[PDB]
Every structure is written in C-alpha cells, then in structure tokens.
C-alpha cells in the first residue's frame, strides 16, 4: 500500500474552519494540536501517511488507557514500536475530535520519532493522507465534527490549514490515497504514466531511475524543467525547473516523491469522500 512506499529522502454547525500552517525550514508544513487537552505541540503535516504518530515524550502524558499496541516504519527511516490510545485532539478555537486513536513511540532507532523529526522540530507526525478501503487507519480529520471531517485543504503559501468541503475551485484535489497515477514530463520529453506520491513531509522529493532517464543514487541536475500533468496528459498539476538546493533524488525504482514543490506552489486539497486520484 501507499506506507510501503513512503520516502523521505533527506538533501543534507460550522462547516469549514482554518488555523494556522507553519512552514519551517522552506519545506516542513507544521500544525499545533493538543492532545487530552495539553500543551501545544507542533506536528508535521504528512499527506503521504495516515496516522497520528507522537515521540515517545509523550509517554508522560495522560491518553488513558494503551488500546493496542504494535511495530511499524516511519518515512523509511524510522522502525519503532508504540502504544495506540484513544484520545481527543484539539486544533484550537475548540476545533475538537471526537476520541479517536493516536500513537506513542515506545521506543525506535535509529534515534526518537523527535530527532528524525528535526528539520521541522515537530513532536509527531500527523498522517493526514486519505486511505480508502482501509477502514483499520483514518486520518484524525475524518473525527471531526460535520462537514469539518469532509477534508482539509492545505495552503502553505498561505500558512494556512482549512478543515471541511474545499472552498476554491479547480486547483489539486488529492483522494482516495497519497499515490494517483499522473503524467509526468522532463524537459519537452514525452508525458509518461506514472505513479506519483503528493507528499507534504517528502522534503525536495525522489524520482525512479527509469522515469528521470538518470542513474540512481545522486540528485536531478540543476537547470532540469518537472512537469506533472493529470494521466490523461490534458492538465498541468504543477512544473518547476530544478535548483542546486531544490532537486529530487533519483532513486533505484519505487515511485516519484514530489516533496513540498506542488504545496509551496498551490493549495491542495485532501478529500476524504469514498473513491488514489488527483484531479486539477
Ligand atoms: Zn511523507
């Protein structure tokens, strides 16, 4: 599924409600949440997970009782183990869940959830991607109250989060999960179909070798023009032209990352209807 192929490759009555986005370090997409009625605490927005994800800090937190329990993979460079709680999250302006499960890293490595975390200073990971067919695993969005569950429409330009039915027209509207089937061009090459992860956490992002027509294991070269079309190659998602400190990765395999660009270039759109698309 989408989790398997989550990468961040590091370089170095109401119906609809907004909060503020923080973007840290150009790339990281950053929201406060209080769990249990707590202290503030900042979390990285994550379109290409689904899950609430907290460091291990917050073991000295009252959530109630451990639910269950289990092992999982983080950004493919985090194992951890952690307890599930049932509690409730709080986006401010009582913008409130229902109790809902969240996760709290017993123990990981290499490091904490906190240090992996680091370029953003996030505490945890709120995994906001849409899982269709997954009824196991929901974004904390979907605990809402009303039409506030229907989606979240991120805006980092805007340094804006707003919750519920999108209120801009056209525009990338992710569904179904993090990973649609797009087309995707470099330079004037031909539009080629390809699998594309909408990941807000995925820093400059990744691209397979054989799709970037480049050998795995460095960076795209600066100067090189991305262009991402919905799959019937009719409308333009996003482009860019590749910098020295704004490339992706090339990887052996696996499936384009887009990272922060399509998000620091537009607001987006995450539904949670039933239907993985990205239409424009
Ligand atoms: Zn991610």
Do not use: C, K, W
């Amino acid at each position: 599924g989408s989790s398997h192929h989550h990468h961040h490759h590091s370089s170095g009555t109401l119906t609809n409600a907004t909060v503020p986005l923080q973007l840290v370090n150009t790339t990281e997409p950053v929201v406060f949440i209080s769990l249990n009625g707590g202290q503030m605490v900042p979390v990285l927005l994550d379109t290409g997970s689904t899950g609430l994800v907290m460091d291990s800090q917050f073991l000295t937190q009252n959530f109630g009782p451990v639910i269950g329990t289990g092992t999982a993979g983080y950004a493919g460079g985090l194992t951890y183990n952690y307890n599930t709680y049932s509690t409730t999250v709080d986006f401010g302006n009582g913008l409130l869940t229902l109790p809902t499960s969240v996760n709290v890293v017993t123990s990981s490595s290499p490091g904490t959830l906190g240090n992996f975390l680091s370029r953003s200073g996030a505490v945890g990971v709120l995994g906001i991607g849409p899982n269709n067919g997954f009824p196991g695993t929901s974004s904390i969005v979907t605990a809402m109250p009303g039409l506030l569950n229907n989606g979240v429409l991120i805006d980092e330009s805007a340094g804006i989060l707003q919750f519920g039915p999108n209120t801009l027209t056209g525009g990338i509207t992710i569904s179904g999960a993090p990973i649609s089937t797009v087309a995707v061009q470099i330079d004037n090459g031909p539009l080629q179909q390809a699998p594309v992860m909408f990941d807000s956490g995925g820093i400059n992002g990744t691209i397979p070798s054989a799709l970037a027509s480049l050998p795995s294991g460095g960076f795209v070269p600066a100067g090189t023009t991305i262009s991402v079309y919905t799959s019937d190659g009719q409308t333009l998602l996003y482009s860019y032209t590749t910098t020295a400190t704004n490339t992706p990765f090339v990887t052996s395999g696996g499936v384009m990352n887009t990272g922060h660009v399509p998000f620091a270039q537009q607001p987006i759109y995450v539904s949670y209807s039933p239907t993985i698309g990205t239409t424009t």
